[PDB]
Design a protein around this ligand. Structure first.
Ligand SMILES: Cc1cn([C@H]2CC[C@@H](COP(=O)(O)OP(=O)(O)OP(=O)(O)O)O2)c(=O)[nH]c1=O
Ligand SMILES: [Mg+2]
Ligand SMILES: [Mg+2]
Ligand SMILES: [Mg+2]
Ligand SMILES: [Mg+2]
Lengths: 692, 105
DNA sequence: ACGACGGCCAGTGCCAA
DNA sequence: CAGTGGCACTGGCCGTCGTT
């Protein structure tokens, strides 16, 4: 086993030069440094470890180092280099599995201070090395007079870079040994730093293997990227900007501008009493200035000739209130609240901070006498929505248009195990929150992401898309877990026609989607009123649906109680018996709250099932001769919880991807002895609007 | 004796007054504005004949002030033949207003 | 001497699963 | 007591840097 890390000139997207690398070999207990001209030797050493059936440990090597080395070896040495997946270990992947309850800076992409809770020390260190090295580099330049530029610290190799490269390795080594010391994931009877790769995967908890395979597969999906229709989105941006401007014009005509105090420093005091009046706007008492200018002549200084007028504008001692002119901003909840109350509106609900709530619910219910302002409320709702779309598609910091790469794809980032439950998190941009087709502008947004937007490298023909989503996943998970209470009764009922449509009708709800947000909000602990809001009714209607569904399957109560009995010994300050659930693959799953336990249990089950699912799906495809890549037959474009969108070179392949995903899901179900049959629904089409 | 302006009457009451008009831009929530108010009442009298005192509440009438780049209140704009002859910002005292007026009139 | 502006940071809300 | 996430906007606050 060896521990390594490299330093190169840029992020994977445009890296073109290997600067250095360090290797720590457990068999020798020594560190070896490779400088820019030792690149060939560095790669030879990694391959030697592979040839010995050994292991290579990186920190974020799955997403960076490994692919980087493959790319740099090709560019710099014209060498083919491909470390096999089974020989690689990633301490970041391990760290995210074992410390799933914690957050991390995602290797410096996120600000430490903005994250909640604590951060693991070693990993925190590794994530700060880049910014830390940059500070030392800058400090040294300003020490020698030289100026600093953009990011010149990475243009050339230097010994300071080399030293950091060495530190990463000693720190990665320490992190590794810390993770290996966790008895829950690694049996104590085995020295995992002294075994071949097969032993490492077979002797460690199943979760260790799953996490590394998921990260490797997902690293690849990131590189693939999601084919994006830039043109279509820029045209949508124009249309949305026009609508925004029009709404702003109408809203500003209706709600005029006004003045507010701003820039006041001193306290206003009663001229007579002299007592401070903190509630009065802050003021400013000029120090210089009068009606006339100070006398400049002798006689003028005696009252011979009138003094020059002081064009100034202020008079010493004469206080005034500094103000600013403010124009109505439909995006300002504060502005909206101000104008509506000035129109007669009397707020009913306020925030825990005192501000009146101004969301779509209240706006919908606001009633003011003036008919023009009453109508303006709709323009405001539309406006807030238009902004939501513009921000996500064009103007936000993570706007799609700011992320399209040269290859015409958006390479969304994914933290395979970012959520406590074992689900992944998506960001930069978040491809897991694209507006749905049935929401305003949804079809246009959704259609911009699609295989059709990718033209085959050889034939120039657009690729096809295969979208597969697991059927009623978390409800089937529920059936599985309560089977010990109802003997698979629910597990059988659930597959008698669509479960959500069956509930939709029974609950008398408008859409199938509404039935979904209802059942899950209900299943996971929503209160009577929350259930009302979801179904567009009151707390009264909430209690009904609650007792109706809870009465229909009393196993829900039994499952909830058993979970409590297992986690809580006493209880909001809680006394825990155990604070974690045992996931399907053996991992510990932190429970934040007794009340949320059921959600932890089911979301986790669904997450691990889906994770093993996408892994098994790709493997089955590869064993069928299909190659993963734009230069092949298929390409993973996105994984949104229990759904995958795959680009395929041909319809035939798309048909096979859909059927293979179904075989894989059933394999996963059999693999973990699930008490409910698992299924998937697939669709073939040009983009995401049609494939989901 | 003070003229209470509105956005719609500001043009003919001030910009076409053909005489000296002292306009006061104020707001009910300003400390200095409440101070100078009493002073403007007295001034209105004493200067009746050679000066007209007018007040414009920037809250009730938000369209006028912006055109004059109001950045502080109370703002005292002395108009003569449709144009600003002199401007002074602040709760001047009785005497200071007098010096100012007598000097610009 | 003063004020525009870019990070930081809570508040608030809504997008998706 | 829906849970699990990401992220856009406003507005308060402050140290940097160009303007008066
Ligand atoms: C929408 C939504 C979903 N969830 C969880 C629990 C389910 C999974 C997957 O969602 P999906 O819409 O596929 O649901 P699924 O049951 O798979 O329905 P399909 O058969 O995919 O339509 O996400 C939730 O907790 N709250 C929600 O509001
Ligand atoms: Mg590294
Ligand atoms: Mg589903
Ligand atoms: Mg889904
Ligand atoms: Mg959140």
């Amino acid at each position: 086993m060896i521990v390594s890390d490299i330093e190169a000139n840029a992020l994977l997207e445009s890296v073109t030069k290997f600067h250095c690398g360090v290797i720590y070999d457990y068999s020798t207990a020594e560190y070896v440094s490779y400088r820019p001209s030792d690149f060939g030797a560095y790669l030879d050493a990694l391959e030697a470890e592979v040839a010995r059936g050994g292991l290579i440990v990186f920190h974020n090597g799955h997403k960076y180092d490994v692919p980087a080395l493959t790319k740099l070896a090709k560019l710099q040495l014209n060498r083919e280099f491909h470390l096999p997946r089974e020989n690689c270990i990633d301490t970041l992947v391990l760290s995210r599995l074992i410390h799933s309850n914690l957050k991390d800076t995602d290797m410096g992409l996120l600000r430490s201070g903005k994250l909640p809770g604590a951060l693991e020390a070693w990993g925190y260190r590794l994530g700060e090395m880049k910014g830390e090295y940059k500070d030392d580099f800058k400090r040294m330049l300003e020490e020698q007079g030289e100026e600093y530029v953009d990011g010149m610290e990475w243009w050339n190799f230097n010994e300071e870079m080399m030293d950091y490269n060495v530190q990463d390795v000693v720190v990665t080594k320490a992190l590794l040994e810390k993770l290996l010391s966790d008895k829950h994931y690694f049996p104590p009877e085995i020295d995992f730093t002294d075994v071949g790769y097969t032993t490492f995967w077979s002797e460690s908890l199943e979760a260790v293997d799953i996490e590394h395979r998921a990260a490797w597969l997902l690293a690849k999906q990131e590189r693939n990227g999601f084919p994006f229709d830039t043109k279509a989105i820029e045209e949508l941006y124009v249309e949305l900007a026009a609508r925004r401007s029009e709404l702003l014009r109408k809203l500003t005509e209706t709600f005029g501008s006004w003045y507010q105090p701003k820039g006041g420093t001193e306290m206003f005091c009663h001229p007579r009493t002299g007592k401070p009046l903190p509630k009065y706007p802050r003021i400013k008492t000029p120090k210089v200035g009068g009606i006339f200018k100070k006398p400049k002549n002798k006689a003028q200084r005696e009252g011979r000739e009138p003094c020059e007028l002081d064009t100034r504008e202020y008079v010493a001692g004469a206080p005034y209130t500094p103000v600013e002119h403010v124009v109505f901003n439909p995006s300002s909840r504060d502005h909206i609240q101000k104008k509506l109350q000035e129109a007669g509106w009397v707020p009913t609900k306020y925030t825990d901070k005192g501000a009146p709530v101004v969301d779509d619910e209240v706006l919908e219910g606001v009633r003011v006498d003036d008919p023009e302002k009453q109508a303006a409320i709709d323009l405001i709702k539309e406006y807030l929505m238009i902004q939501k779309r513009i921000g996500q598609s064009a103007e936000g910091d993570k706007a799609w248009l700011r992320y399209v790469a040269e290859d015409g794809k958006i390479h969304g980032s994914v933290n395979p195990n970012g959520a406590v439950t074992g689900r992944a998190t998506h960001a930069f941009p978040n491809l897991a929150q694209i507006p749905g087709v049935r929401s305003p502008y949804g079809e246009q947004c959704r259609a911009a992401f699609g295989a059709e937007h990718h033209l085959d490298g050889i034939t120039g023909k657009p690729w096809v898309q295969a979208g597969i989503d697991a059927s009623g996943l978390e409800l089937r998970c529920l059936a599985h877990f309560m089977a010990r209470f109802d003997n698979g009764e629910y597990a059988h009922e659930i597959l008698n026609g669509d479960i959500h449509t069956k509930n939709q009708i029974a609950a008398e709800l408008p859409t199938r989607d509404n039935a979904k947000t209802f059942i899950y909000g209900f299943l996971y602990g929503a209160g009577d009123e929350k259930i009302g809001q979801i179904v567009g009714a009151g707390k009264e209607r909430g209690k009904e649906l609650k007792k109706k569904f809870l009465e229909n399957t009393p196993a829900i109560a039994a499952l909830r109680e058993s979970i409590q009995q297992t986690l809580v010994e006493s209880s909001q300050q809680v006394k825990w018996k155990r604070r974690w659930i045992k996931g399907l693959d053996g991992r510990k799953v932190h429970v934040r709250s007794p009340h949320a336990a059921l959600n932890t249990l089911l979301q986790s089950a669904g997450a691990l099932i889906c994770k093993l699912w996408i892994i098994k799906t790709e493997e089955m495809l590869v064993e069928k001769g299909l190659k993963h890549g734009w230069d092949g037959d298929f390409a993973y474009m996105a994984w949104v919880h229990d759904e995958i969108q795959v680009g395929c070179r041909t319809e035939e392949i798309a048909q096979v991807v859909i059927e293979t995903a179904q075989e894989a899901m059933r394999w996963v179900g059999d693999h973990w002895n699930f008490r409910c049959l698992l299924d998937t629904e697939g669709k073939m089409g040009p983009n995401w609007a049609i494939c989901h | 004796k003070i003229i209470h302006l509105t956005d719609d009457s500001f043009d003919t009451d001030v910009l076409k007054a053909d005489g000296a008009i002292l306009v006061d831009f104020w707001a009910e929530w300003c400390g200095p504005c409440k101070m100078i108010a009493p002073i403007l009442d007295e001034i209105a009298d004493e200067y009746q004949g050679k000066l007209t005192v007018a007040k414009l509440n920037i809250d009730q009438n938000p369209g006028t002030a912006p055109k004059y780049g109001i950045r502080g209140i109370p703002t005292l704009l002395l108009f003569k033949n449709g144009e600003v002859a002199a401007t002074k910002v602040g709760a001047l005292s009785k005497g200071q207003l007098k010096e100012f007026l007598d000097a610009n009139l």
